[PDB]
């Protein structure tokens, strides 16, 4: 499972950089995840693990990894052939619960991604709506 370990290295190396994360570093992470597509389940698992465990300033970067991988895979393998979005959708509620533990000023950056996902049909709207509701309810509490 060499391909996964290279992805794991790229993903974890986010900790060596102060957010905002560069286009270039995001690309490296994404290139690594695509190269590991035989183990896409393990990639999704590592990403979900990073998001659960990382410092608060890294939650939005973790979300950008999901966005970046999903979009690249749809571009590279076809919208309807993409394995990553359907796989990420399985634990997405749990994932966003962890993402919303980000700094106050970072909540809006998560909604921006959700709005883009909805606009560009990246995830099914039925998947996206409760995630948006979650962000809204956070502002009333």
């Amino acid at each position: 499972m060499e391909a996964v370990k290279t992805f794991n290295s790229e993903l974890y190396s986010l900790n060596d950089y102060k957010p905002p994360i560069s286009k270039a570093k995001m690309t490296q992470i994404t290139k690594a995840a695509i190269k590991a597509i035989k183990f896409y389940k393990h990639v999704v698992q590592s990403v979900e693990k990073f998001i659960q465990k990382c410092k608060p300033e890294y939650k939005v970067p973790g979300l950008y990894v999901i966005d970046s991988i999903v979009r690249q895979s749809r571009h590279q393998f076809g919208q309807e052939k993409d394995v990553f979005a359907p796989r990420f959708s399985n634990n997405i509620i749990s994932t966003f619960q962890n993402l919303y533990r980000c700094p106050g000023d970072d909540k809006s950056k998560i909604v921006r991604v959700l709005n883009l996902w909805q606009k560009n049909n990246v995830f099914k709207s039925e998947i996206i709506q409760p995630l948006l509701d979650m962000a809204a309810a956070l502002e009333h509490h």
């Binding site: 905002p20 994360i21 560069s22 286009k23 570093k25 995001m26 690309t27 994404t30 290139k31 970067p61 950008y64 966005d67 970046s68 979009r71 690249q72 749809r74 571009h75 590279q76 921006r112 991604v113 883009l116």
Partner: peptide, 9 residues
């Protein structure tokens, strides 16, 4: 990174 930035070729 920008979530509107075109995917790499």
């Amino acid at each position: 990174y920008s979530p509107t930035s075109p995917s790499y070729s």
